[PDB]
């Protein structure tokens, strides 16, 4: 018939009770990556269901033989790091030839390569039984426990070419098991009063500026202001993004000797001003995004044409092509300080992505519909995807997972912002709106109501207490976090309001159409 | 073209090949015969 | 409904049974209502709320459906009641009679600033400032030690930026009439530093009324 | 207390065969009607001395949707005459644009595609990207254009004047 | 005898520039030299010419047991290349 | 013209209130042109089924047909989550800083000149 | 660039903060472990191994499944006694084994016949290798989504008219209950820790091995 | 054995070659070919009369949506 | 005014019954490892006689099908000449002439004695060090299926594919590069 709430709530305690969770949220660093450290490798295994269980009489001492013939010659730079390495492995595979036990082939093992403190060695010498190795009450203590080496990155990229060649899964069965490596890369009463009055702040701090675009054709996009406010970008309908100055520079363009528009016949011969206007024409559809990279050296845009084309700010021209999702991108934002950048496509999937590989690195699914707004974390640690189907996730660029889920929303989101101390989220949509929810409870105490339309962007204030809802309804109001909690209503003279951004000073950047 | 509360079934979906094991678990067509056979002529 | 089906069932040339239509004119509602909702991802995302010809286009050629091919942008196809498209036109006239290739297609950007002169923020009216004023101008600056710190923090804090009177009064009266005392100057230029170092002020438009100023300062 | 204005802004300080084979069909019509009336009543090589042999060129003016089409309706409507016929429907003329359209497009677009990619390799399959696209899209090569161009253009020509010339002869036989 | 640099300056266009051209800027190209843009504005030419030459031959063998284009005219000439167009002619 | 009435009301359904008047008339055309294909495929399956009467399956079949290679739907809620199982031991590159944001190395982007062509 | 070195620092800083020092059976029993066997004899032998032997079979002897590997053209085993011959050369099995995944097919056999061990999820699975007298192997099993996502899709089939609304809260709750405790730090220092701490186990091979 | 991946591309290219993770990728898009034509064969087994046979007749009316015709006797 | 809106149907919920590889072999199947599928399979629609032109017919059409794949792979890679329309024979070398040379014009104009015939095919134009390209990839195939999409017309065996596609790109970074770069000047 109809489900009740009350019979869910015993059906998830059920499934605890089930599997056992009879038996934490903190926002302590320092226990989380103690935690960190220990189901790092509790229980590790890589190369274990696919060890090579084959016979082999005759692979430890043609394996590691092959080891001191490539390791000791004609290399000096990188060596220091990696002759220390092999003391050990003579010991473990010894051990290895304890467990197994055979005749004669562990006296061959020790006797022809007996060169390579002198007490460990002569303890394996007396010793060859795995009894003995168990009452000898050292031995045993050394098979319960890893052999750690700190060497560089480079050391163990010298590392990971060798086990690569032929004959060298016996070799990686003691590193997987047995080596554990690291990587490293007068009252004054009246001071008293003023500090709790001026704290809380009507603060009339909105400092509006505008940016217009005069009578065009009616199809534009998206419009982003460079943080430094040195470019203004905007993307077209008809593939074009245009790039204007701000500051009146007049920059110039430098040469490049390759072109990706230019068609270049076979008739042509290799042979080697303005500003205020430049057509950047690389993409074949519509541009659904545009960001910037925080540093005003480059340009990110996703287009309609199922590709991420990544654009330079110094050869002015289209460099870097990611063939990724291979179905139209909707929406596209870049991390803090650079790191990453992420995209949602129709997949009901966003992917994880990165500035040296052109292939996705992580995979997010579990959507019902289509991917239309992701943001990062101020820290770049967690992702947030929304979609149409009412839902809004919390994901992490590490591991992959949903923590968290959010529902309660009557319609699709169309906005999403990250509060700038990182414990606040909103989101916004078609239902007129506008939600904020708490990290750590994940319960909702707002219920925003001022819009009559769509919300098109969310943006935080610097100071984590005010916020800027865009909407299709002519209305820039900036409300007050720190319908009765709004601070100035703009009035629309303009079609609409494309974004809104808060970089400093409290000022205001809408952009609109005239 | 008609009008209702009910959403309208076309009963006639794209059918995706996956079928339905342990009423929870999906598989492609394959790549799950023998080992099904295998422990449930056994386990049960 | 079904009566339409059974319309064009009969020019196809065979009747069908009336159990069959009520599925068949289902399965078409679906059909359209479906691309109607993949019409509407391309529609409510780029910049608009209109529907045009492409968008329907386009839902179709990534559905693996053929793009109906036949109607332009205009409004045309009168109905008069029955589709009737007989227009027999020449091509002769129609050939070279008025052409013009002037596009006039071009984009500006401007900026201007818009206040939400003195609008109703000039003056000191909140009662909130007044009182605040008198502390800062006499009891911050001279003679009172072991007050710059805590005041000049709190100072530092707040931006409460949108007055525009007081910081250009302490500036031209401690500067254009101050110039020749000792004691004054000092503490002015170190409270004037520390609001250089309050990353809440807007003092971008506001370069002309103080460095000038300024540069009084190092003159003699 | 006063002050200075204060808003700093930065202001921009900006605000022939086709034809002639249509005028012979029209004088054979000239001469039919007054016939089916008087019936019942009884050395080159391309010199590298110019702009147009490399890519250097005029920008081409930019135009909107609303106009493309119009243009699209007139190429049509006198390539159409050129081929032999005298009237058609509308929606005809509509259904052979969007055809056009979408054939210009996917021609286009395959060639974006066929750019970029060797963009990254270095390498082309074929010493031309303009001969490729036309492989996987139908026509041989562009020597196949001559031919085309020959045979439909100029044969088509000579032969329409020498109908022509004929039935001029028969005007003047007959009156 | 002669190159086609200037056989390709025989060809008299129909098509202007400024829609072939319009069609590579849609893609993402300039459109700003004279040379590249007449293949695409002939090859577009041969294309219609073949279906219109087409509906010229399926014209005059009609009812043969001024020239009027119809449906009659267009739906077989379309279907060898894989045109499906199917109208209704009342309501 | 009953059918313009629905058609618009339909798209009222769905949230929109300003269209063309040219794209209700392309929806009752694709509808039309939808029921003569499946109709045809109906023919040939009645004919293929050696009977002079149509039947309603062959029409189910049919219908069944056209969604299986005429229409686009991704895999849902069971094929991307194998992705991210069989992508989930995919580890992450250190961050190494020296300018930012760094580039894919040279080849393996859009950045080549044609090998035929030279100067 | 002067951010990334402060945040390197303060992510190298609590790194040796976490490894040194320190800071009802999942979480008690490994903080029990930390306590004990914490202490070192100043010698260049630290004692981070898996040793999940000694965390729980040893001490306290519970039930445990384990898994039989016949070398040479005979494939592998699976026990509950009433052993079953599965050939090799199948990507079914090794696959699910090669990480910390729970492979569905345990899944369905450990709801409806069998009530034995109950992990919080986890399960802990025994692999024999009798050609390298077999060896000891004791490796966790953590569940992924794919479980938790089925899992609904269990109680979805109960023919009670569920609606998506209610589906989706209990996607919710469901997630809630066994969720992960999340840093809420807007510091960029915790990148640095989370990526070597996530790499330190997966630096062997993804294409080239 | 006899044909296994490498004679048939010599079969269409004499100078190919083919990376060794796009050989198991083709044998899975043969895989899932053979699946989805004798799923779609038994379809209409089924369907002739509520089933009769798996016919090589009918196979040949299923071929039209692949575009391909069967030298066979038919 | 949001109740009016529908929901797309899930294709999950419809599925079928199950009671009761060719993939890790490296092989192509034949006729005796498909007659043990098409019987398992066949049990679950119930059907009987077990005929034999059927599986030569499902043989063969795999084998076309392959052959389509590798066809449509290479012509994205290589050259090739139409015979009378749309026929694809070459697939081999540079004999087609570069068009804007008047000696290739005249050349197309006019179509011991044999090896002659070969040198105007072979050496009329072209590089003096043709280098052939690398093998093909994951991303050749990728792209082959974007831009042609004629090879697979089912949906149910496109997709699903391409997905697994995708997962297997892969490229060397910069970090790989030192060590080419190393073994390189160490055998030097």
Redesign the interface.
Known sequence: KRVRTEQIQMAVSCYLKRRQYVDRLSQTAEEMAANLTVQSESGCANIVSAAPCQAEPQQYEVQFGRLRNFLTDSDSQHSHEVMPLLYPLFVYLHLNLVQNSPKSTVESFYSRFHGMQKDVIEQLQTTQTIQDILSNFKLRAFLDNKYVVRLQEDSYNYLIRYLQSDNNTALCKVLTLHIHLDVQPNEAALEVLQESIKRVKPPSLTTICFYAFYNTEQLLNTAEISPDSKLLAAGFDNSCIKLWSLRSKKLKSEPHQVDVSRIHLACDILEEAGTEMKILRGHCGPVYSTRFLADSSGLLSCSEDMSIRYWDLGSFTNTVLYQGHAYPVWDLDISPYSLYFASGSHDRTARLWSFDRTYPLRIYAGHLADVDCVKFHPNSNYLATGSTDKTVRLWSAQQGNSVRLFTGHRGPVLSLAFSPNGKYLASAGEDQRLKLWDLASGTLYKELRGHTDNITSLTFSPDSGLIASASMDNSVRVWDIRSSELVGVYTGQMSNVLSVQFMACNLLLVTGIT | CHYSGHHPQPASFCTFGSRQIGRGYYVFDSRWNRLRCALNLMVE | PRESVRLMAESTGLELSDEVAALLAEDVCYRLREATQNSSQFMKHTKRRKLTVEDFNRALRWSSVEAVCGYGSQEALPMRPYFPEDREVNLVELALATNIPKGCAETAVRVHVSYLSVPSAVSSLTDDLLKYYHQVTRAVLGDDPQLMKVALQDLQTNSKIGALLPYFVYVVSGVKSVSHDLEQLHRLLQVARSLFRNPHLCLGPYVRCLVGSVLYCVLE | ?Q??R???????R??????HT?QLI?HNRRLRNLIATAQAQNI???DPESD??????????????????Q??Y????????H??????????L???????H????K???????A?????????????????QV??????????S??K??QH?IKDYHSYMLQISKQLSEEYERIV | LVDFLMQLEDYTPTIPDAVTGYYLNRAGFEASDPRIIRLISLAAQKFISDIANDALQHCKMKGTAKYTLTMEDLTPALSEYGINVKKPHYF | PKDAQMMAQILKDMGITEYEPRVINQMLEFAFRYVTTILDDAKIYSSHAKKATVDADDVRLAIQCRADQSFTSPPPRDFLLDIARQRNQTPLPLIKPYSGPRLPPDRYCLTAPNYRLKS | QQALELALDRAEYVIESARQRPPSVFQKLYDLYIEECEKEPEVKKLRRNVNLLEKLVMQETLSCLVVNLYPGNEGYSLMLSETIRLPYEEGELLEYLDAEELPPILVDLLEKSQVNIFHCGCVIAEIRDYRQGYQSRHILLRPTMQTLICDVHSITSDNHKWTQEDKLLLESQLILATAEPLCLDPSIAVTCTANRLLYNKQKMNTRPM | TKKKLQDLVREVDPNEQLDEDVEEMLLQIADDFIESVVTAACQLARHRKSSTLEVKDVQLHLERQWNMWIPGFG | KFDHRFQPQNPLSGAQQFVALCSHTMMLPTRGQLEGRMIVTAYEHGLDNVTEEAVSAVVYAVENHLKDILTSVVSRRKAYRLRDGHFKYAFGSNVTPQPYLKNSVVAYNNLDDAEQQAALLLACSGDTLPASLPPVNMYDLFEALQVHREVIPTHTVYALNIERIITKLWHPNHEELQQDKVHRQRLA
């Not at chain 4, 900006?14 to 034809?19: G, K």
């Not at chain 4, 021609?107 to 595609?113: A, S, V």
């Open positions: 207390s002050t200075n204060s808003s700093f802004d930065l202001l921009p900006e605000f022939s065969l086709t034809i249509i029209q080159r090589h391309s147009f042999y490399r890519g250097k060129g005029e920008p081409v003016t930019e135009l909107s949707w609303h106009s493309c089409r243009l699209l007139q190429a049509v409507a006198t390539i159409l005459a081929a032999g016929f005298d009237c058609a429907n509308e929606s005809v509509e259904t052979l644009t969007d055809v056009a979408e054939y210009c497009l021609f286009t677009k395959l060639l974006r595609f750019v970029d990619r060797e963009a990254r390799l270095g390498q082309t399959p074929f010493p031309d990207v303009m001969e036309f492989h996987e899209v139908g026509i041989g090569s562009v020597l254009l001559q085309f161009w439909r």
